[PDB]
Amino acid sequence: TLVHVASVEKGRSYEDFQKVYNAIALKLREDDEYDNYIGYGPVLVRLAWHISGTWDKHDNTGGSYGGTYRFKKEFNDPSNAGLQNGFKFLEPIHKEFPWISSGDLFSLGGVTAVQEMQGPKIPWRCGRVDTPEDTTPDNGRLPDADKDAGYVRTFFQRLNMNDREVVALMGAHALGKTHLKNSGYEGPGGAANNVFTNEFYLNLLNEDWKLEKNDANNEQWDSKSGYMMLPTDYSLIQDPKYLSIVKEYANDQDKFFKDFSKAFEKLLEDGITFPKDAPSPFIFKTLEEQGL
């Protein structure tokens, strides 16, 4: 019941944040080899989600505001295994722009990755403020993958997301891959998708899925094509309400982009109070738009 008021980094404006965006985007382009040539796009999206997804609407603990992923309890959350790669990517960015708060940097990294991967524009607001180590939420607030649609629906109520918002946000699972050592769910061994599209929904609907056990003895849904879905992914076509929305996004790229952009911004802003005279949300230009 904590109040976190957005406070703009002193004297900073749109141009300052576009510079940070640009530095992230340029490094995304440069460090192209990461994870068998997937690049750092997907892991930066996952990082922005995990630092936000600790939020609890009931007492306003967790959330992106405090930048608490920088503290050992949170960065060592078993749910966050692999995200150290995103944090290391952002380290030199933070060094170049030491004035940006940690929450702002982690959330901006997600926005930048989505846009640079040809996703929708995601309006972004500055003003998250680093909070002390004792404000770090405990482990166990991020969702399990081995569960069903009812679990997913209930889980996301804590983040104030409804069915449409849940289904839209899950479209980010078009990006990157599971890594057996991180999560107990499997390779492809090589490259995966690093372009932001509605392919998650198309694959759910069109692939011939088989329920198999992986080398970690966990069940996952696999296709002959070499794709996989988590049990929680597959639950979106098992539940009739989720299934309708899956079909909608599979058949309308623009609608998916618009809904994802709204839900992703909301996720990244949950728990933050923006003063009435705060700057309007910024919409950053991509490198391509800038001729960079």
Ligand code: HEM
């Ligand atoms: C029911 C909710 C969710 C569950 C159970 C879940 C679970 C997982 C798991 C187990 C992984 C694999 C981690 C690894 O092995 O490296 C993963 C990866 C990923 N997740 Fe989710 N996730 C959920 C929701 C979301 C949301 C809401 C987003 C963003 C909007 C997201 C973005 C990603 C991305 C981009 C990756 C790929 C990361 C990489 O390639 O390094 N996930 N997720």
Ligand SMILES: N=C(N)C1CCCC1
């Ligand atoms: N369904 C998939 N292939 C996603 C890859 C990252 C988590 C799940």
